[PDB]
Design an enzyme around this catalytic site. Structure first.
Site, PDB file in Angstrom:
ATOM      1  N   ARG A 258       0.855  -1.181   0.000  1.00 31.52           N
ATOM      2  CA  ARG A 258       0.000   0.000   0.000  1.00 31.52           C
ATOM      3  C   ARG A 258       0.892   1.232   0.000  1.00 31.52           C
ATOM      4  NH1 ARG A 258      -3.277  -3.497  -0.785  1.00 31.52           N
ATOM      5  NH2 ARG A 258      -5.466  -3.515  -0.116  1.00 31.52           N
ATOM      6  N   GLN A 287      -3.615   7.169  -5.628  1.00 34.67           N
ATOM      7  CA  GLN A 287      -3.623   6.139  -6.657  1.00 34.67           C
ATOM      8  C   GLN A 287      -4.955   6.186  -7.397  1.00 34.67           C
ATOM      9  OE1 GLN A 287      -1.407   2.163  -6.374  1.00 34.67           O
ATOM     10  NE2 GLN A 287      -3.510   1.598  -5.823  1.00 34.67           N
ATOM     11  N   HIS A 311       0.049   0.160 -10.790  1.00 32.48           N
ATOM     12  CA  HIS A 311      -0.503  -0.896  -9.951  1.00 32.48           C
ATOM     13  C   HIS A 311      -1.121  -1.987 -10.817  1.00 32.48           C
ATOM     14  CE1 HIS A 311      -3.668  -2.409  -6.909  1.00 32.48           C
ATOM     15  NE2 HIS A 311      -2.510  -2.986  -6.644  1.00 32.48           N
TER      16      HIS A 311
END
Lengths: 353, 356
Positions: A258, A287, A311
């Site tokens: 994270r 994000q 990601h």
């Protein structure tokens, strides 16, 4: 029943690969299955705004399917408006975008599940890839070739073997322990881990791991550090300027857990100063990362040490197949009334933890 | 004695890292030790042309130290002129730049030694790294971040896990086996290998490897192929248009052994067409790779699938330390008259092959 599925638009990329199940164009490869069994499927990537396609269908949606790679935020208000909601499924792993606490408080019989285990190997491989990439200085090496250069010394001056290095993971859950397992045949000096609970003795000794009680003792002795822990109060802002100052000088840091576990500017400053030789991973905060995010342009003194990616580690085509099959099994356990869920997939069972 | 040491010039990089022993500036860390023992050390990167510093000192050089990353070509012509040459060292592993045939077939009393084993881990790690980079589509993903973009589907559509893939190695020598060892915990569908001789049953079982009798059947079933074999008549041009037509469609290929094992143009054609999803490794032919070498610009249909680097896998700082220590030990054995060389380090002892 009405099922609303929220995924990103792959656009042309969906037509390129039929196995890219986790997009609106391919609908997890289950649109026929749901239609076969008489259910209506609402697929959309429009998850923001009051007139989002999602919000129009919330009032009578029996089931909502979501994904961490385009997370429909199941908010307090949306939970209030979802009058027929019985089940929220994460086609993947990660429930940050679901107000689980509120669902529990309302007393509504809303089950929430995820496909546990479908992501772990994919992320674990990504950590070791990133470790090897940074330690061996692959990124500037490939840049020389594509830039039509050839200067070995400029690459070898900061390139090492991962053998003989002390590697520590913060967290030894499903992902972290699978990282340790893959590192054993690379012959590290030692494998270390910090976690809020001990590994089982047999599991610990399988990888030759040693547990370190506190995180300064862990990082201070680690050549390589990887973050494989859940995000909570203990780990929020954990990797800040103070803690980084106890890292071994020139350490390599990897985070696939994270982005918020780090303080962005502190990590960037550590790389520029030489406190870190390299930083890598695929998680960001915010994000998706804005164009200005300092982890995009940050480099070490040699113009390298950056192995960042978007990601995507957990959405490889093999993970997506597991995501789609897992979602189908969860839906099937629900449609049939057996509720024979896999115990590890349950986040809330009819509103209860 | 006179020692002629041939390495590349590192320039500023030598100042940046004192542990970069394998360059002319840092002289493998043995300059003072040789000076203390009364020997004359000639260190140069100039190894091409009769006027080279190398050729100037060949006629009365007692020892010549070489490296595969800046190879001084010890040819028949140079050996004839080396009237005092007693020992040729490879500060590393690899002796294709030395005419061993001429030394052994004439009977000349010259020993050739290399630091055996010091490159194997470094190359094996670089194969695994390249495998993971190609399979998981890292290069275009990282390229997105540094170009200030974010489009996950453009990467995910050609990103896989190395888990559940069939991985085959062409050659199961020291590096090939160490690649397989590092792959076991990644849970491949199967580890396969081809070699002119079989591994011991215990070595096979340790890594769960299965022998395939011929290359054509080996690559037909392999998602991933890695080349871990020497360059000889059986491997020169092995990876060519035909053999590539028998690869599993969309396969990933890794080659950290020798560039000449492949036909460069044939590999690029297989990558552009989609026969190969990606190609990676650090060995080229010609080497150094000229700016127009096809492997620099080649890409798959998605603009990706290239994990090429310069030839550096075996010259990491950890290996360079093993090279320098290994060279010093060889020289110590020579200087003392003990000749107590490590048996595995001997290529030729006074011009003769010795039992392995």
């Amino acid at each position: 029943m009405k099922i609303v599925l929220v995924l990103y638009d792959a656009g042309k990329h969906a037509a390129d690969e039929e196995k890219l199940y986790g997009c609106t164009e391919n609908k997890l490869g289950i649109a026929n299955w749901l239609k076969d069994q008489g259910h209506e499927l609402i697929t959309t990537s429009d998850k923001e705004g009051g007139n989002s396609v999602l919000d129009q269908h919330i009032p009578d949606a029996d089931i909502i399917i979501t994904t961490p790679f385009h997370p429909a935020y199941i908010t307090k208000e949306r939970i209030d408006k979802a009058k027929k909601l019985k089940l929220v499924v994460v086609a993947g792993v990660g429930s940050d975008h679901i107000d689980l606490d509120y669902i529990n408080q309302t007393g509504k019989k809303i089950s929430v599940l995820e496909v546990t285990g479908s992501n772990t190997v994919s992320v674990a491989e990504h950590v070791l890839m990133t470790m090897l990439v940074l330690v061996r200085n692959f990124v500037p090496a490939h840049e020389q070739i594509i830039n039509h250069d050839w200067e070995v010394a400029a690459i070898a001056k900061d390139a090492y073997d991962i053998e003989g290095k002390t590697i520590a993971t913060i967290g030894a859950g499903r992902i972290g322990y699978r990282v340790l397992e893959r590192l054993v045949p690379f012959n590290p000096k030692e494998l270390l881990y910090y976690d809020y609970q001990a590994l089982p003795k047999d599991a610990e000794e399988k990888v030759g791991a040693r547990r370190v009680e506190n995180i300064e003792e862990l990082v201070a002795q680690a050549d390589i550090v990887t973050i494989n822990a859940p995000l909570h109060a203990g780990t929020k802002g954990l990797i800040n300027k103070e803690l980084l100052s106890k890292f071994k000088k020139g350490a390599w840091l990897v985070n696939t857990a994270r982005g918020a576990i780090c303080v962005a500017e502190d990590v960037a400053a550590a790389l520029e100063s030489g406190q870190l030789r390299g930083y890598g991973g695929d998680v960001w905060f915010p994000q998706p990362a804005p164009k200005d995010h300092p982890w995009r342009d940050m480099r070490n003194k040699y113009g390298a040490g950056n192995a960042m990616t978007p990601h995507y580690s957990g959405t490889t085509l093999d993970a997506q197949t597991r995501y789609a099959e897992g979602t189908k099994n969860i839906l099937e356990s629900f449609f049939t009334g057996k509720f024979d869920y896999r115990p590890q997939d349950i986040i809330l069972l009819n509103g209860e933890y």
